[PDB]
Ligand binder design. Structure first.
Ligand SMILES: Nc1ncnc2c1ncn2[C@@H]1O[C@H](COP(=O)(O)OP(=O)(O)OP(=O)(O)O)[C@@H](O)[C@H]1O
Ligand SMILES: Nc1ncnc2c1ncn2[C@@H]1O[C@H](COP(=O)(O)OP(=O)(O)OP(=O)(O)O)[C@@H](O)[C@H]1O
Ligand SMILES: Cc1cn([C@H]2C[C@H](O)[C@@H](COP(=O)(O)OP(=O)(O)OP(=O)(O)O)O2)c(=O)[nH]c1=O
Ligand SMILES: [Mg+2]
Ligand SMILES: [Mg+2]
Ligand SMILES: [Mn+2]
Ligand SMILES: [Mn+2]
Ligand SMILES: [Mn+2]
Ligand SMILES: [Mn+2]
Lengths: 289, 683, 289, 683
């Protein structure tokens, strides 16, 4: 009942980072403190890693196991967006704002950062555990994918949105909003596929799947807290970002058909402001008048 | 935003559900109160103005020296006594942005409308003060408008040539191709549009000095010509405009056409070279009967028969070409070729269509040559003889290359003044003067044909404007009746003036004795068919003017027999692009494309309603795209029966109609006697 | 040396089925004979069936085994074009020209057809034989992929191009031309990835891989000749189609860095009508000797 | 695969760790016993062969009619008495594929090597049987090789022109530009490579009669010439090759260079027209001092001084140009321009570099004109006077457009036969005959310069082959000593033959009296410096031959003063691309690119070892890319000191080296007196 409308929405949302000129951010970037620039680079690098794996691994593997040519076409399109559009856009931002050495250093930093490695290990592990014709392993990977789309990106998205909302780094911010617009529909779509599998189960099996989903969310959440503190303490925003990730965790649960898990909190209003002609043959009667 | 531009944009603002057309008039006043008068250079007297313009190399000394200063002052006073006022803002804007003489720094205005008209009249009269005053009264009444080259450049030292339509014949040789490229460059340097006939050129895969598969065809020549026209672009002012014409029975016709396809590669497509296709009646007969046609290799035909393929009548030669084993040919489907032409015209408006037999069944100078191709605007249809440009230190055989002299009657102004005869004769005299004063030292065949043929093109404009302001629909039979009568009178007085000039000067055009004018055949339909209006409304429109009858046409035929005719060609209806704005007229005899046209100049928007447009005549000013193209074809054929040359006939199509509709319009034009089809503009 | 350049060319060629209005083809379709309509339907179904294998297996399997983030992104983009763009385009052409029952029957026929099946299963067999961390098996699959993209499609493309060059079925012919333009670049790109593997091999292993490629080409070519006669004899075109197959076989070989196998031949003109050194500044004292 | 192809491929199959060079010989035998002898057309006697070739329009009957058939039979018998055998398969293959005469359908071989040599000798002798036998002995011994046009086309009815290269001066006018395009097409039709000097054309943004920023610059003319050369492509057989030369002080020099950038847009990129840059010593001086230079607008300089910018010495007029406010100029960085030249040559091998002051400090005809540009191979360096092509019906002022006939001495065969003098004199006579029988009816300046200058080009081939086969390293000082002595001998005997021809004909070349030959200045370094070999090995190599001393040079100087010189220019070392294969010689005086070259013909691959390559001389056949370019520059300068025209000097670069290394090589070439640099080929 939904794939065709998602197909149409995904293809109509198609974009490339080159559509957005980035040289306009040069001055507002220059004006940020060293702490702010550091957090910003690292935040986008963490996002780049997530999209790299979502494009290389997550979306293609889910596409492989989901039945139906139209469902596969949507998932293939989403996969392309992840690595050919989203992951690449971050390099466009980096290449504009930062010198090569700072770019090299931040990519080295992703490799050695323990929270980023842990979250990649956990998510990719679940993708690679999918067994052919085994719907339960597929469900588990789809939960992981929804958590990546609708929860994990948000510790990263906070900062570009926070600046956009203050009228700073607005070209980079425009790119990020386009990425966010895509991930929102990706999270909903994968959520609907996960619910399909969940709804086939016995009540006992469903109870176990909810346990899996909630245990996984809590494990990812605890790691994301440490990641958030590590990045945001130097810019004074860790508590604010934490409220934002809890907000989005609830959206991820809802995408999976589950009740919200965290209590509602006031999000920084700045971040909320951050959001040929037709041819006929000639008849013999056309030659006479 | 300037005040006049606001007053002009206030037209679209509707008051009481009606457009504020009268506001345009106010805009003109502003455009003269705020801008034109402030930036117009004024002198203490006309003597100082003329001295400043002559000394600063603005004017020519020769044409002003033919008059005493008193006569020049009298001509200027006659021009200014009319107190001419531009009725619309766009008229004055177009004149003072395109035609008014400006200083070298382009910040001040040296010439008003009356000054330019007086200078052009003095140039026309060539020393006759009374004739100059007659020309001034003709142009200040806006009855006759010299073409953009003549109007802009007459009397100016820093100027191009007064002729901008040139037709070149290219012979099948490398020397002739190089000479054609050189002449095209020289004529584009002069500011003229150059049309080249490529039908005599041998097709791709022909032999050069008995080595096979050596010729690049006409497409390589088109690439060379396109580069030449890109290079010669009026000293970097306008984009170099050229046209190439190929017969549809030339084998390269597909590749020719393939030069205008969007999918064509960079080594195939020509961008600044317009293309036209010459379609003999034989091709239309083959397509009609669905028989497969043959496209011939021109060099094999030349070797077999000693004449070029386009130099003989294909109607009687096609079967002999097909049955000749020594003539090489390729099988094609003529209906597929027609569909390809229609598709290409839908995509880009190309090629121009020339119906060869429609042109040549009424051509008066078939003895000199049959009309093989047309001009860049597809309205000049004249006899041309190819030139044999030999090697260096060897005498060339100079032929005839067409270059006619443009000038347009304003039908509304001419008919409201009841001065068809006087306007036609004065326009003919001015065109004769400009043709006689044209001397091109780098185009030998153009110069020879200008001296010999003395061909001029007298066009008409504001046909739709006149019809709409008189409560006549362009597609109505009354409009065609008016066009028939008006253009028969235009032809009558043009022939009478040509014969009078021949009698006065004692000379006709070269090879006139073989023309149908000399034999009296041209006047046949005029001595047997009465062209008086068949409707009472049109007759009342022609009230106060003598309409030539069959007896008058017999007298004119006898006069031409006794005295000859000075001009080989007299009438051709050009598109009249920008001069129609200055004259506040609709372009050519075409119907209007839009009732109010929106244009963007600089960073400002401007609005030009069609002349005389109001609430009462809003319905009569029907847009061309909304019109039935069959009735437009009927009107153009009605006019064409009185025009010796062609008419720039643009098709106006909707996006809904397909290539079948375009082909049907083309075939109905061929059936109705249309000589040329200019453009297929899709809305 | 090449992936970013191909990325650029791929993304700038992006298009969607909806851009070409198909209905005006019915004005020439109605004038074709039964044999012409039959051949067209069968050719179209052949292309559709082969392209589906490439979208579901061929491109995604190669993307899975190739190392490099940028290569995976380009390959993902190509897989997207197969599934989201090409497959929808073929379906659109079919739905325009034939009623539902006729489409189902043509696909039933072509699905059972011996020559279509032989080539489809030969290609799919090589994709299924790729082994993790075995570059030889990957190379063999890449050869199969290049043969599909740059060679096997062309016995099919011939007919739409033949009509397109005559002014018939122009809307569907425009679509086919866009598809073909994508397959051309796909073939060139996968060819470069195969040459990279080939160049890492010993001389004996190279000779062995060359023998594999030529042997595979021979098997496919002999089946193409039979496929061609089966479809095109009824419309009298087989001789010219065979020339077009050999010409495209040579292009496929050149994509794999191999010499042409077949002598040069001219192609049907109707179908043709359808178709840095290191900059080092001068340091002075370089002007004195 | 053919048997000879397998035998030729057997060379690379090593036996006992060594290449099987002798297998190559076997291949030739196969190539003759299986293909050539079967595909040859044999007649009963020579009479039937000559009659068949004459009536079937293969041979011109005029040159054969000057001899009785007994004399022609004697010449052919002299050619066949040598029993010439091709030592390598590729020599015979190249001759019988590129130069042997075939039938109209190219299915059989009508001309053997001896037949072709006999026909060329009979054409050269012009009715002298003994001279024809001398030419036969000279060519069958392979001491002298006429250029590809002369060797291929001599005595043929379907021939082109025997002149290889043509150099045109383009004046700054539309008429001159169009004439240059026409002449370029005519000469490319004749098969010759055309070089055009665009330095007189005014730059982009110049005024065409008081309207400023109107010119398209040299880039528009470049596009026109590129399209002209594309169109005239030897009837589709060989791609039309053109060269454009621009002075480095021209304002368009950057845009010029931008025509060869790989990122250039289609409206600027030119792909079939080679580019050359003429660098005066002033530019090198400015770059050396790092002082910012000025490029100039040619039209402003012409207006101020009455002469073109390239018509006068920049070394003395650059400061006057800079300090003159009426001269328009743009600031450039000469070092940045040099780096751009190096980058362009690394990317594409363009531009050609012509060191103008190096050419003109030893140019013997500076009185006629300074050398302002070179040919398509950058070895022709002659005086040229620009032509004033005026309007039609106006007389044109015909200048001098360079054109010389090429012919190469085979150094190995010349020195083996100890016949430097005889070979040089006979080659000079043959080139004089080729010049005399050359008459081009569509290039007037070329015809006038051929008639007046009488310039010929006598080159040399197999320098590296001779050095490697004699155990001399090409970079060694002994090799440079050999080149010095050999080319001093060649210059001495060429001057002697030119003076003897002037004495026997009683005429010198036009304006010889003002040349350095007439004043005796040319012989200065020859009457004060001894060019005998300084090494015992080279002296032994020159044993049996009288090496001219200062006394012989003084006698020759007196002889020239008494009698004059027939040829304005005598020696030019062309690349000698494909005819070096037939002679079993290394290309020109350049070092070999590779010891064994793998070339793909049809679907087969062939390996050509360098002539005389073996185990004992493997390392003497050092590849050019592995050589120090500074020592190659030293060799080329040593040869150039004895060559009046230039030498096609190709730079052979490694991929590792930077543009700074290329700039250093260029500056060392300029320092050492190198006149021109041909190509920057990177391995
Ligand atoms: N519509 C117009 N077309 C042409 N010129 C105009 C127009 N309106 C004003 N002008 C110019 O501005 C001048 C001022 O004209 P205005 O309407 O103020 O009254 P006027 O009685 O015609 O004036 P004047 O004393 O100048 O003759 C005119 O003489 C004329 O030169
Ligand atoms: N390398 C070669 N170059 C030129 N011509 C050759 C060559 N090899 C063979 N031929 C030609 O093919 C013929 C084959 O004869 P071949 O050289 O085998 O020796 P032959 O029959 O003993 O006679 P001869 O050597 O005296 O001509 C030769 O006479 C010659 O015309
Ligand atoms: C006509 C024309 C000339 N040119 C350039 C190229 C020529 O080298 C240069 C000279 O043209 P000319 O033919 O000499 O023009 P001209 O003689 O009328 O002008 P002037 O008196 O100043 O010499 O102008 C263009 O670039 N584009 C053109 O269209
Ligand atoms: Mg000829
Ligand atoms: Mg000039
Ligand atoms: Mn993403
Ligand atoms: Mn996503
Ligand atoms: Mn596909
Ligand atoms: Mn594909």
């Amino acid at each position: 009942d939904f794939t065709q409308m998602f197909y149409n929405q995904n293809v109509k949302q198609f974009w490339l980072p080159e559509e957005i000129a980035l040289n306009g951010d040069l001055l507002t970037w220059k004006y940020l403190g060293k702490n702010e620039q550091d957090t910003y680079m690292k935040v986008l690098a963490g996002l780049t890693l997530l999209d790299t794996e979502q494009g290389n691994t997550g979306m293609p593997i889910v596409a492989e196991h989901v039945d139906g040519h139209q469902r596969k076409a949507v998932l293939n399109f989403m996969a392309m967006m992840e690595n050919a559009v989203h992951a690449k856009s971050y390099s466009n931002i980096f290449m504009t704002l930062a010198p090569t050495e700072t770019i090299n250093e931040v990519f080295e930093w992703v490799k050695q950062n323990k929270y980023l490695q842990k979250k990649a290990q956990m998510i990719v592990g679940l993708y690679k555990a999918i067994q052919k014709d085994d719907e339960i392993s597929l469900f588990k990977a789809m939960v992981a994918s929804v958590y990546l789309e609708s929860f994990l990106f948000y510790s990263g998205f906070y900062y570009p949105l926070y600046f956009y909302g203050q009228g700073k780094l607005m070209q980079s911010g425009e790119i990020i909003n386009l990425i966010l617009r895509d991930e929102a529909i990706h999270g909903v779509y994968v959520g609907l596929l996960a619910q399909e599998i969940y709804n086939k189960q016995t009540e006992e099996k469903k109870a176990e799947l909810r346990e899996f989903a909630i245990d996984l969310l809590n494990q990812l959440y605890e790691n994301e807290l440490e990641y958030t503190e590590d990045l945001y303490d130097q810019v004074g925003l860790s508590h604010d970002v934490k409220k934002f990730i809890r907000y989005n965790a609830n959206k991820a649960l809802m995408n999976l058909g589950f009740d919200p898990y965290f209590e509602e909190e006031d999000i920084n209003p700045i971040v909320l402001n951050g959001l040929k002609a037709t041819v006929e043959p000639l008849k013999d009667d056309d030659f006479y008048f | 935003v300037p005040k006049w531009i606001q007053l002009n944009n206030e037209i679209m603002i509707q008051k009481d559900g009606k457009f504020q057309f009268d506001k345009d008039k106010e805009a003109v006043h502003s455009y003269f109160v705020d801008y034109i008068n402030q930036n117009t250079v004024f002198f203490h007297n006309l003597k100082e103005k003329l001295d400043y313009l002559v000394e600063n190399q603005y004017y020519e000394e020769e044409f002003l020296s033919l008059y005493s200063f008193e006569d020049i002052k009298e001509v200027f006073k006659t021009a200014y006594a009319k107190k001419f006022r531009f009725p619309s803002f766009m008229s004055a804007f177009k004149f003072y942005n395109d035609y008014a003489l400006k200083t070298n720094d382009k910040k001040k205005i040296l010439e008003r409308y009356e000054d330019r008209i007086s200078i052009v009249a003095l140039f026309f009269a060539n020393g006759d003060t009374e004739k100059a005053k007659e020309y001034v009264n003709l142009m200040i009444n806006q009855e006759y408008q010299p073409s953009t080259p003549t109007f802009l450049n007459a009397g100016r030292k820093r100027r191009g040539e007064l002729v901008s339509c040139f037709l070149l014949e290219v012979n099948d040789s490398l020397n002739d191709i190089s000479r054609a490229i050189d002449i095209s460059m020289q004529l584009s340097k002069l500011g003229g549009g150059v049309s080249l006939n490529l039908s005599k050129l041998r097709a791709k895969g022909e032999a050069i000095k008995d080595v096979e598969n050596a010729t690049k065809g006409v497409v390589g020549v088109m690439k060379l010509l396109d580069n030449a026209f890109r290079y010669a672009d009026q000293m970097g002012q306008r984009q170099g405009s050229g046209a190439a014409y190929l017969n549809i029975f030339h084998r390269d016709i597909n590749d020719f056409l393939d030069t205008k396809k969007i999918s064509a590669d960079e080594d195939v497509r020509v961008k600044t070279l317009s293309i036209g296709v010459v379609i003999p009646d034989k091709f239309v007969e083959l397509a009609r009967e669905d028989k497969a046609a043959y496209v011939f290799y021109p060099h094999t035909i030349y070797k077999e028969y000693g004449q070029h393929m386009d130099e003989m009548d294909m109607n009687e030669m096609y079967d002999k070409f097909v049955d000749n084993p020594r003539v090489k040919k390729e099988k094609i489907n003529p209906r597929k070729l027609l569909e390809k032409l229609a598709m290409l015209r839908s995509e880009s408006g190309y090629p121009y269509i020339m119906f060869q037999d429609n042109v040549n069944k009424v051509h008066a100078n078939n003895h000199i040559s049959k009309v093989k191709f047309s001009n860049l605007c597809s309205e000049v249809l004249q006899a041309s003889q190819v030139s044999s440009y030999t090697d260096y230190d060897e005498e060339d055989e100079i032929g005839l290359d067409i270059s006619c002299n443009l000038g347009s009657l304003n039908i509304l102004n001419v008919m409201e003044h009841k001065s068809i005869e006087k306007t036609v004769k004065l326009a003919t005299d001015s065109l004769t003067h400009v043709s006689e004063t044209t001397d091109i030292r780098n185009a030998p065949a153009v110069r020879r044909a200008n001296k010999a043929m003395k061909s001029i093109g007298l066009g008409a404009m504001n046909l739709h404007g006149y019809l709409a302001q008189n409560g006549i629909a362009y597609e109505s039979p009354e409009a065609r009746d008016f066009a028939n009568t008006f253009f028969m009178m235009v032809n009558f007085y043009s022939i009478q003036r040509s014969a009078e000039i021949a009698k006065e000067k004692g000379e006709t055009f070269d090879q006139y004795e073989g023309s149908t004018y000399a034999t009296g055949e041209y006047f046949d339909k005029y001595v047997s068919t009465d062209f008086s209006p068949k409707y009472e409304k049109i007759a009342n429109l022609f009230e106060g003017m003598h309409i030539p009858t069959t007896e008058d046409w017999k007298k004119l035929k006898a006069f031409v027999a006794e005295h000859g005719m000075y001009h080989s060609y007299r009438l051709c209806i050009a598109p009249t692009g920008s001069i129609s704005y200055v004259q506040s007229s609709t372009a050519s005899v075409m119907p209007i494309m839009e009732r109010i046209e929106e244009r963007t100049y600089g960073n400002s928007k401007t609005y030009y309603p069609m002349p005389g447009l109001a609430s009462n005549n809003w319905f009569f000013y029907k847009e061309a795209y909304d019109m039935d193209m069959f009735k437009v074809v009927d009107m153009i054929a009605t006019i064409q029966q009185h025009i010796d040359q062609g008419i720039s006939f643009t098709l106006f199509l909707k996006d809904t109609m397909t290539t079948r509709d375009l082909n049907r319009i083309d075939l109905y034009a061929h059936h109705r006697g249309i000589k040329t089809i200019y453009y297929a503009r899709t809305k």
